[PDB]
Ligand binder design. Sequence first.
Ligand SMILES: [Ca+2]
Ligand SMILES: [Ca+2]
Length: 81
Amino acid sequence: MVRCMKDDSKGKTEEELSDLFRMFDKNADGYIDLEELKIMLQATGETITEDDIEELMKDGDKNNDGRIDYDEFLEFMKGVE
Ligand SMILES: [Ca+2]
Ligand SMILES: [Ca+2]
């Protein structure tokens, strides 16, 4: 009769990929592109070139659309590095 019920958000690894996605989105539309990702890289204090930002979308592009979503993210994180 509802004694243990659901638990609180614990340490999630792969299942936590849902939260990491929003961290890459600038407006949270469900998908990201080079234009958006460009502003995300600005967070760091290094020097990135237009060609460097492409490497992220390239290896990340699984649907060949030029963007990234929860689907392409789950695959792009299935062993890249
Ligand atoms: Ca976006
Ligand atoms: Ca795609």
